[PDB]
Design a protein around this ligand. Sequence first.
Ligand SMILES: [Mg+2]
Ligand SMILES: [Mg+2]
Ligand SMILES: [Mg+2]
Ligand SMILES: [Mg+2]
Ligand SMILES: [Mg+2]
Ligand SMILES: [Mg+2]
Ligand SMILES: [Mg+2]
Ligand SMILES: [Mg+2]
Lengths: 127, 181, 81, 108, 214
Amino acid sequence: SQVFGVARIYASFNDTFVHVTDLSGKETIARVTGGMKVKADRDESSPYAAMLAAQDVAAKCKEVGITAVHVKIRATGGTRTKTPGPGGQAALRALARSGLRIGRIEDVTPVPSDSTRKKGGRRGRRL
Amino acid sequence: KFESRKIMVPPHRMTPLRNSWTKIYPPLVEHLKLQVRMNLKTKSVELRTNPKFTTDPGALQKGADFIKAFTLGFDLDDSIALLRLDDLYIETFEVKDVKTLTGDHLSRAIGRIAGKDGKTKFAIENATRTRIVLADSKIHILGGFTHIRMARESVVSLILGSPPGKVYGNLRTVASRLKER
Amino acid sequence: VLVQDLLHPTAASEARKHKLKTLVQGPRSYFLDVKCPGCLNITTVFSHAQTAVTCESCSTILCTPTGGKAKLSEGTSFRRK
Amino acid sequence: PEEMRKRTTEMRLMRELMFREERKARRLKKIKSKTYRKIKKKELMKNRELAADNEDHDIARAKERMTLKHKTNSKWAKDMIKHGMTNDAETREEMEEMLRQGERLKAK
Amino acid sequence: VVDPFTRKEWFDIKAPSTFENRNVGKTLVNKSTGLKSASDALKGRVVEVCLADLQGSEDHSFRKIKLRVDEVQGKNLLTNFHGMDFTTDKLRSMVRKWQTLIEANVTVKTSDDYVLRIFAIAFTRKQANQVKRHSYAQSSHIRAIRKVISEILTKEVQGSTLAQLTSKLIPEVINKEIENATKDIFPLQNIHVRKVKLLKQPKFDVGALMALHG
RNA sequence: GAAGACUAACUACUGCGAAAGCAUUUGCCAAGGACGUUUUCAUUAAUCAAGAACGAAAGUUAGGGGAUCGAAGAUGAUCAGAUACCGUCGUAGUCUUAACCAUAAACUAUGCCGACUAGGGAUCGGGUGGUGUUUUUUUAAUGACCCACUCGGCACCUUACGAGAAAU
RNA sequence: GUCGACGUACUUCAUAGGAUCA
Ligand SMILES: [Mg+2]
Ligand SMILES: [Mg+2]
Ligand SMILES: [Mg+2]
Ligand SMILES: [Mg+2]
Ligand SMILES: [Mg+2]
Ligand SMILES: [Mg+2]
Ligand SMILES: [Mg+2]
Ligand SMILES: [Mg+2]
């Protein structure tokens, strides 16, 4: 009946990658970033850029055979933030509003059983 | 086109869910054409779009965003604002994700973010048109993308050490250059 | 009641205080007398034992040590001395 | 019965009320920082006055004249004055506060 | 200059015997050229299926399964069992304040000699007239529970091959055995096994694999 | 797959240690406080110039290791404002064995031992009591809770009869 | 050498508070 693929949404400060692969993970069918869809560098990570990214991927994969996706959304993780920002959820919203069928949303950020140092020093990084 | 979500409920927000349920299932059912069901035998809300009634494909994720924003700690009306508009996102971060603090230092950091009688928190919300809930250490911000980057930059300038008077002053400057645009 | 006699405290009061803090201090254990079923003869056993007291003739066990009062083995009869 | 389960949920909610209040009071007990305690005392005296007989005043004046406790022959004040330490205006704030409190008592 | 989805050919992943919905889904390879035949490019993939979508259930909405492709025949490719896991959101929602967390693992070799390492989690609970609010254990209980859990996992793995262990993991029998054998020590809600992962697959033995989908 | 650090959530400034400090499992080694005691010795004690053991982080000597972060250094930008003064590579270090060094807001800005002085609710450890609840084996018995008590800890509330100029 | 670290000697900066009246 249906054909399923996975949509991996990396949602960093400074981009959002919408990847769509198979179940297996290896073969990829559609990568777009957010950076391909706005040529201003202000706002590679802006929600609007993410929306355009996701619409392009949904179109391209609908032109293959693939009608439903499970989504795996992740922030940077590691020793940085661990929760998807706005770029990932804008991509998710604009992916559900696309005629794809979505099942089984989850969230796989890498989370350490405590790990190495964090960039920045004794006084914290960003302000 | 029959489709679902299911989102879990942590226990400190399970009393206010079964305490404000009466205002939640209506603007999920008629206005959205969406079929709620709350499981208790796994403590979780479940939603399903039924193929007959529904029109907007974004209804299912609209409702899931609404309930989840109620889950993270935001009051009912604010989550309703997440249900209505199309420009509302949440950004969550920590206190150990800016500067590694622990011991008493961390409880004093939350004291500077929250201010006495909530004042400092409210100032950041009122001059940025966002809504902040400040959990154990994790801090959650609701608004539109540019506004939450303004409020994130003030909160992070408060974690790292800057006093609160400086952030009122810089906040009202931000309010000036926000309200004109 | 700020005159209840320190020289005559009611036995409930002296019964709940620590053993070193009653008016004239004294022990709170007792010696209890024990018969194992198999023999007839009896032996005296401290209530708070620290040695597993083998019966004398039918030499098995009568009590096991605990952190406090001894745990009497269930196949036993006893009478407080 | 089942009314026991009602009793247990009542004692549960009392215990967690007790624990939240005790956690708050611990964290506040550690903050000694004389501006923070000074602010809390100021707005307390304001709320005390808003929200919430001569004989008590005459006993208080009598004890104050018997004792003369609020003049600069006291150990703290004579220490501060005699070692030029009250020219800094904060400890002069404190010393004047002592003196006016004593002057409130001696008024008739 | 390519448009790569002109040449890739779909295949379909079939679950093993010990599951209800044996069909799983499709996957892409490349066309089977001479000089890089396709079949030698399928034979190591692992696939993640959430076993609700593999057993029709819905209280199995956590517990992803990893299935590994090992054989291929005529646009069917037959799989195996690679490991099992929880979804990270259930696991984040069990772990709460004012209670203690007991965890245990073990390394164990099965009947068919698959060496595998298997995890286990458990949490204490407030017995239903407890008033005091936390109920931690006393850490000389926790070593008793850890030893009990480890003895039961060791015993109950290696009296089974792999298929039997798999179908002792689906109806969650190990949970009930842990629960019964560990309630004179301490109350202990929420027992699970939360992970199992292979470390040494022995040697191929086509007979077992084609005995599953036989 | 390799490597070297680190032990998140649970996690409570509650627990332990003379302090510095200590958070994955399992075993081995030796040690420790409190409790219980109708055991034992019988003043063996308290505080201590000299003298001695230990003493975070940084730092030196000689080997090992060198993943991450990174004093110095080198470079990119120096775009009104920097409000939003940083990017990139990184030697020493960070880790460890054997010797050095002997300092911290080493904090309770508070010497140690002994006595007395008030009311309460909680929590950690030990003990005593209970025809209380569950864990039933089939009724026990432990274990887990509940209630009362008691010794010994870390803290909290309310009042002083008291103390202070006041915070307390 | 209008040199540094000390050791002596000295100088200087921080004083008004309440009440009534205008
Ligand atoms: Mg000396
Ligand atoms: Mg050192
Ligand atoms: Mg070093
Ligand atoms: Mg070296
Ligand atoms: Mg670097
Ligand atoms: Mg030394
Ligand atoms: Mg310290
Ligand atoms: Mg010193």
